[PDB]
């Protein structure tokens, strides 16, 4: 039974307020923190901010914190639900909310309590959190994931010209998670050396996710840079590349992608319809070891999505397309729009729904890549989530900034706990379990 | 009694390996991680890296980890010392090391175990860590500190032209720690807006400590920028400025400071002897609300240090000068070289010595500013240390990057625990207890 639930305001990796929940059972205190979130969006669960631009730039969360403390807390204490009843507790809170997008209480309110209940539940049962998640998802085995280290930024998370949002490396050819961390950090540093040389020391500063953001023009330039770091590190053929185009941002008029790559007059110099953008992807695919591409098109450019998924043998990740929403996932499944779900727990709002989102996708042949948010915290929960859900692939930042390393370090501790019989997804990252 | 001690390698906020120690007593597991460190230096305790440039760029720590596991661990388990005997445990390890700078076992080896023992000791006694530290240091009361948020970078931590290393803001005029976090983040954001405007979006990327690093020329430019953010935020007169000149880096020939501010030929354009540099400081002091200056001169320019300390009424912080070393502190005390110790626990190597370093300084009228390292971890130990040592002032990064916010968030949780009777150093930050 829950003896106490108390939320407080803490600050995320970007300097903005966010919710932190303390939950008590006779076993003790269980703490969880909530990452980023859409303060308003039309597909994902709404994180409740205050909007008073006077206080914290309209980003405070005293409201979400209050909904937890004086609404969720007393109600769930009297509900008599045990932390061992994840689905029931999550269900209760949603009922309590009434809205479909958790707009009454706030998804950040619900998720914080939901995450805390999960950690408490694993403690009630006397098992580590990754095991409790596996059991909730019906897995008998867990597996160490392949990390997708964001290393070069553009579009967002940083701001130059480079329209493609993320360029990541994936040590698919690593023998273990330890070895993948080594391959990952070494390349990261060698890449720092390269960017410093090619663009000067000042270009080695980092964006929200710890990745460099040199003033590069063509996306291909980014890939070449990465390709050099891998060679320098001597990891050619062990590391593959991954992308997140976030194409929804530059989708302009009908069938037109652009953004002028952040140039109010770069127009025409990038008057490329989806098919031209799709061809461009294929060139990259044969020229670089690109194994996964996220959001190649706008979240509503369904037809170019299906075409690309049908015509390639690489992973096509749905982020803005699916929005961790089972309704969106279902449509994307019917349309064969993609073959991978980017799992962002705060997008849906609870642990139970997040797990169901993953099982849906997995049931329909998809892969699942667990994802952090731009605004993360020191909470390392998704590290246990990715191991527990046996997805084999996590995207939680470059190995720089501790809100990122908090997750990676935790997966290494888990690895150490699994012993010699710890399995690393590796080349089977797309669907290892 | 210690039933088990096991170290492992984890990654710091910069992507480099560092030591993490797990310590067990019948009360459970107590974990601590070690930050940055001088892999070799002549004044501070030496952190042991491996040097094999093939592995992790010569930065691995399997040696330090091994010294813990197969040397420190069995020895301290059989020693029969209790975690409640901080001084004895720390003493034992130093004996065990034999060297003066902890070069046999590695300061990173010793400090990790030392930090873990401290957390275990507070648990043995049933009190929070900040209280256990207060009691170790003989304090009856604890006090919430004034945060020194590094916001603009130069010299190191980033790399432009700006030779002065750090420019920080200090909400000395805040009513509480909560209010100081608000004042701190708001200014940080307003400053992001300003830098974006004046130098473009790309200039808002951050360095090792979460602070922006625009390509500014004159240090005065940095101060003006900050001054604008404070005005925009509407906090003029509540926030003061702090600096860390790290002058040791640009100290060239006899009585000559320069660095050409990172220009192989900026020579002459900054042929300034100490006295010219000292005058420059005074101009800043009357023109901007500068309350504290760290390392105004080279760690051996003793005479210009004394002159400056004697002639001003602001805080003069010794970082490279003192190196958390009681021998250096003693000399600086005799010479009246400064009036504040920057406390970096890993510089000295143990909790006991760190506490003694603080008491020495405090006994001689100095202030103590607890400091993080460039390469931090998600460990929030120094947050309890600064509250416990009643220093009233901590320098743990900009409110950006979670290895920084881990500390700030922890001080807010402590604040919440102290209740209404929680005292905030504020204007008395220099020596509040
Ligand atoms: Mn995306
Ligand atoms: Mn310094």
């Amino acid at each position: 039974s829950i003896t106490k639930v108390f939320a407080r305001t803490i600050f995320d990796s970007r300097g903005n307020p966010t919710v932190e929940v303390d939950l008590y059972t006779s076993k003790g205190l269980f703490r969880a923190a909530v990452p980023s979130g859409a303060s308003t969006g039309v597909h994902e669960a709404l994180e409740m901010r205050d909007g008073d631009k006077s206080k914290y730039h309209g980003k405070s969360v005293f409201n979400a914190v209050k909904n937890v403390n004086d609404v969720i807390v007393p109600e769930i204490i009297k509900s008599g639900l045990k932390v061992t009843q994840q689905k029931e507790c999550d269900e209760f809170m949603c009922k309590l909310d009434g809205t479909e997008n958790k707009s009454s209480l706030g998804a950040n309110a619900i998720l914080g309590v939901s995450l805390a209940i999960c950690k408490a539940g694993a403690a009630e049962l006397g098992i580590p959190l990754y095991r409790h998640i596996a059991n909730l998802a019906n897995y008998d085995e867990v597996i160490l994931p392949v990390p997708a280290f964001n290393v070069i930024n553009g579009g967002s998370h940083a701001g130059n010209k480079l329209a493609m949002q993320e360029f990541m490396i994936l040590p698919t050819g690593a023998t273990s998670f330890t070895e993948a961390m080594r391959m990952g950090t070494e390349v990261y540093h060698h890449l720092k050396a390269v960017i410093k040389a090619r663009f000067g020391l000042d270009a080695t500063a980092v964006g929200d996710e710890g990745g460099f953001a040199p003033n590069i023009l063509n996306n291909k330039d980014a890939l070449d840079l990465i390709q050099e770091a891998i060679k320098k590190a001597g990891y050619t053929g062990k590391i593959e590349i991954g992308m997140d185009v976030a194409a929804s941002e530059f989708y302009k008029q009908n069938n037109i992608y652009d953004l002028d790559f952040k140039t109010a007059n770069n127009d025409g110099s990038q008057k490329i319809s989806g098919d031209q953008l799709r061809d461009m992807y294929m060139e990259f695919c044969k020229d670089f070891p690109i194994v996964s591409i996220e959001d190649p098109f706008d979240q509503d450019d369904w037809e170019t999505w299906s075409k690309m998924t049908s015509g390639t043998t690489i992973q096509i990740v749905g982020d803005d397309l699916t929005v961790t929403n089972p309704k969106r996932i279902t449509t994307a499944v019917e349309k064969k729009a993609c073959k991978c779900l980017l799992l962002k727990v705060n997008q849906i709002g609870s642990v139970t729904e997040s797990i169901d989102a993953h099982l849906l996708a997995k049931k329909n042949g998809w892969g699942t890549m667990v994802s952090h948010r731009s605004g993360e915290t020191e909470d390392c929960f998704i590290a246990d989530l990715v191991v527990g859900l046996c997805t084999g692939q996590i995207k939680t930042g470059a190995p720089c900034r501790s809100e990122r390393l908090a997750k990676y370090n935790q997966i290494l501790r888990i690895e150490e706990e699994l012993g010699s019989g710890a399995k690393f997804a590796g080349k089977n990252f797309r669907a290892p379990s």
Side-chain angles (χ1 to χ4, degrees), chain A:
Chain A
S1 263
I2 296 154
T3 67
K4 183 184 186 194
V5 183
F6 174 88
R8 82 178 103 280
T9 297
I10 51 155
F11 296 79
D12 65 39
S13 60
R14 302 212 304 130
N16 297 127
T18 200
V19 177
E20 180 174 271
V21 173
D22 272 23
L23 182 134
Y24 294 79
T25 64
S26 288
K27 283 293 204 305
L29 160 81
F30 296 95
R31 168 173 294 155
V34 174
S36 287
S39 3
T40 266
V42 187
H43 284 149
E44 54 210 289
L46 289 216
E47 87 171 326
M48 185 176 282
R49 306 300 206 149
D50 297 353
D52 184 353
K53 301 84 178 183
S54 170
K55 302 165 60 168
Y56 312 86
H57 291 41
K59 287 163 189 174
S60 58
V61 296
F62 306 111
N63 286 328
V65 172
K66 142 264 165 297
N67 290 331
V68 171
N69 292 322
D70 39 73
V71 185
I72 295 170
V73 178
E75 280 311 309
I76 201 171
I77 307 266
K78 302 316 155 198
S79 77
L81 293 166
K82 282 58 68 183
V83 293
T84 258
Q85 299 178 280
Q86 194 69 50
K87 183 193 180 187
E88 287 72 43
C89 297
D90 284 325
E91 210 142 70
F92 169 92
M93 296 190 277
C94 280
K95 296 192 195 303
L96 217 59
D97 176 273
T99 72
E100 192 202 304
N101 58 340
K102 300 180 179 62
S103 44
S104 189
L105 299 182
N108 47 358
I110 298 177
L111 181 66
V113 180
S114 182
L115 291 173
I117 285 162
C118 199
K119 308 200 192 177
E124 265 305 297
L125 301 175
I127 52 186
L129 182 62
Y130 63 85
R131 185 65 65 185
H132 178 60
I133 291 164
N135 299 163
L136 288 167
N138 251 278
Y139 289 103
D140 289 326
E141 289 230 41
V142 296
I143 198 173
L144 300 175
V146 160
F149 301 116
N150 188 357
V151 295
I152 295 278
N153 303 268
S156 185
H157 301 191
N160 31 37
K161 218 72 167 309
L162 186 57
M164 242 118 279
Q165 276 203 8
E166 300 167 49
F167 287 80
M168 318 172 227
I169 51 154
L170 290 80
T172 53
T175 299
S176 53
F177 193 85
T178 296
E179 201 207 275
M181 280 312 300
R182 172 184 190 186
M183 285 174 35
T185 55
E186 295 190 342
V187 170
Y188 182 79
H189 291 130
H190 272 120
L191 172 65
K192 185 170 64 183
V194 174
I195 295 164
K196 188 178 170 184
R198 264 234 63 204
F199 319 67
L201 182 60
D202 60 293
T204 57
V206 304
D208 300 333
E209 308 204 352
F212 317 106
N215 185 99
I216 28 192
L217 306 169
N218 53 292
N219 312 274
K220 173 182 168 296
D221 254 355
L223 299 160
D224 285 298
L225 231 20
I226 288 168
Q227 275 283 73
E228 181 167 4
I230 302 173
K231 176 202 76 71
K232 309 278 295 175
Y235 287 132
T236 303
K238 325 287 181 53
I239 289 169
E240 306 191 288
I241 297 168
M243 296 174 49
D244 179 332
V245 192
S248 1
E249 311 286 10
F250 37 112
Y251 178 49
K252 297 309 163 189
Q253 276 43 252
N254 45 56
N255 61 73
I256 281 304
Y257 286 82
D258 217 324
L259 182 67
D260 281 22
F261 287 29
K262 314 174 190 184
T263 310
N265 231 220
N266 210 176
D267 19 68
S269 299
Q270 12 194 294
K271 179 160 298 181
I272 62 177
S273 59
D275 287 309
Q276 293 170 302
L277 182 53
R278 182 157 61 84
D279 185 78
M280 190 188 310
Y281 290 140
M282 305 304 187
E283 302 183 37
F284 288 170
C285 275
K286 42 167 291 191
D287 292 332
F288 303 100
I290 296 181
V291 291
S292 182
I293 295 173
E294 180 179 330
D295 277 348
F297 304 100
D298 181 51
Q299 59 187 297
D300 287 331
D301 197 11
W302 289 111
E303 267 67 270
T304 326
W305 270 91
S306 307
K307 296 199 193 100
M308 196 177 172
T309 301
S310 273
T312 54
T313 54
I314 62 162
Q315 183 170 273
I316 302 302
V317 190
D319 184 30
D320 294 316
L321 182 77
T322 38
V323 190
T324 318
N325 184 345
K327 278 135 280 174
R328 293 291 293 194
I329 300 176
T330 279
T331 289
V333 177
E334 294 190 344
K335 285 170 187 284
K336 298 181 295 175
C338 57
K339 57 225 312 94
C340 189
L341 173 72
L342 190 78
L343 184 58
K344 283 166 176 182
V345 306
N346 82 306
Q347 208 146 50
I348 188 61
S350 71
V351 172
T352 289
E353 291 169 281
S354 294
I355 288 183
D356 285 355
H358 159 258
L359 294 176
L360 175 55
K362 195 226 48 172
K363 190 201 62 172
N364 294 297
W366 293 18
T368 294
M369 178 171 266
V370 167
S371 188
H372 59 349
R373 279 294 211 130
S374 57
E376 265 305 310
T377 68
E378 57 268 44
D379 192 48
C380 57
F381 179 98
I382 61 173
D384 287 82
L385 187 70
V386 65
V387 170
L389 287 191
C390 227
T391 81
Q393 45 182 314
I394 179 168
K395 175 209 202 191
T396 194
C400 176
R401 284 190 170 228
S402 296
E403 70 267 27
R404 269 72 231 188
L405 288 321
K407 287 70 158 168
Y408 296 125
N409 289 317
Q410 177 57 357
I411 296 171
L412 281 166
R413 289 188 286 257
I414 292 171
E415 170 195 50
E416 169 193 292
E417 189 179 304
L418 292 179
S420 38
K423 308 80 60 53
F424 172 59
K427 297 307 305 86
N428 314 76
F429 76 93
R430 286 189 55 190
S433 316

